[PDB]
Amino acid sequence: GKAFDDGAFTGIREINLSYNKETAIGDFQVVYDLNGSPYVGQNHKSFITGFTPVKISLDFPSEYIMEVSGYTGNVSGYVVVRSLTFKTNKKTYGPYGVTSGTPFNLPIENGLIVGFKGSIGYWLDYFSMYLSL
Amino acid sequence: GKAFDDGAFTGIREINLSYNKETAIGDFQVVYDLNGSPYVGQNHKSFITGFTPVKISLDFPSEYIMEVSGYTGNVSGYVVVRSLTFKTNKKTYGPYGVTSGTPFNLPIENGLIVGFKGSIGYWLDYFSMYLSL
Amino acid sequence: GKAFDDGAFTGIREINLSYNKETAIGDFQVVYDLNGSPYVGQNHKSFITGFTPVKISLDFPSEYIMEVSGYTGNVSGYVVVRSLTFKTNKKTYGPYGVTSGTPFNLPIENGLIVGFKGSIGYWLDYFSMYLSL
């Protein structure tokens, strides 16, 4: 996959992703908050098409993510992120993609996700999250 | 004065200011670093013109500000920042302006200035700094 | 169970825990660093005894935890933390306990675990971690 690293911002306004139930997460793009203004992150695209798009538009700053969860699994011999769920203080977005494989979850008791980095080939290979107060 | 607030960034690449050796600091604009890329801050301009511009171009990321100091004094009835000096780990820039009145200084033993806010009218009225690890 | 909360410190010197190879994690106690001196945390004990004790003594400050992983599952009708593994920049400690149920893992790319909180009845019911730079 191609590595990406958005760096850290003030918060999250919108997550744009795509997925296919038969495979995994494809594209990933985030509109961050930067000091009260929207910052349009680069669209990190899958090498292939055929994905269903999802736009998660948060009620920033009242609404913020409190848990990221999902599953990693083998698709065509590659370990990738097959599924993602974003839980906020208001509602739950997802699961997007099949909930089969090795689960992971990052609940947050205090603090905020402020950035993403990762790698995308045909599918989202892996990702990490910047956290701040 | 008109209030300003740049918010917080990753670090500082360049400071552009203006001053007059008979009055005080006039304009103020910062080029920040935002996750390894330059981010050109809003240019905070005095209501009047006639100042001498100066550009402090830092050797980012190896060069960073360790102390900000200056003087506040009365100019034509206004209490304003009459002078600024920026000391980095490499050198001292300034003083710019008139070194007369009440001194202030912010020395930093650990951490970074990552943002500025304040107010500018005819002159720089006041300012505050965001600090981060 | 009995809730506990150590709060946040400057680092971790030692982890003491206990476990049983047929049930789950029982006891948990951390020796923190506090400003370069050891701080012996409260010993959070199961309501029952007969666990096997384990002492993880880290080469503080150069050695630190980079990933905490484990399994949560069912023991006598209760969801509990059945196993823990601690991976540092130098060594892996564990798994301790029973490696079945739902896996979880917290890998850290940047930053430190500086504190723990959670709840312990017959077994460790749940836990959270304080993270800092």
């Binding site: 990738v80 992971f104 990702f127 | - | 850290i108 730079l133």
Partner: peptide, 15 residues
């Protein structure tokens, strides 16, 4: 150095 730092958790996925 002159670059601000943030906690990062992860990665989850491959590698």
């Amino acid at each position: 150095s002159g670059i601000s730092q943030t906690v990062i958790v992860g990665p989850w996925g491959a590698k």
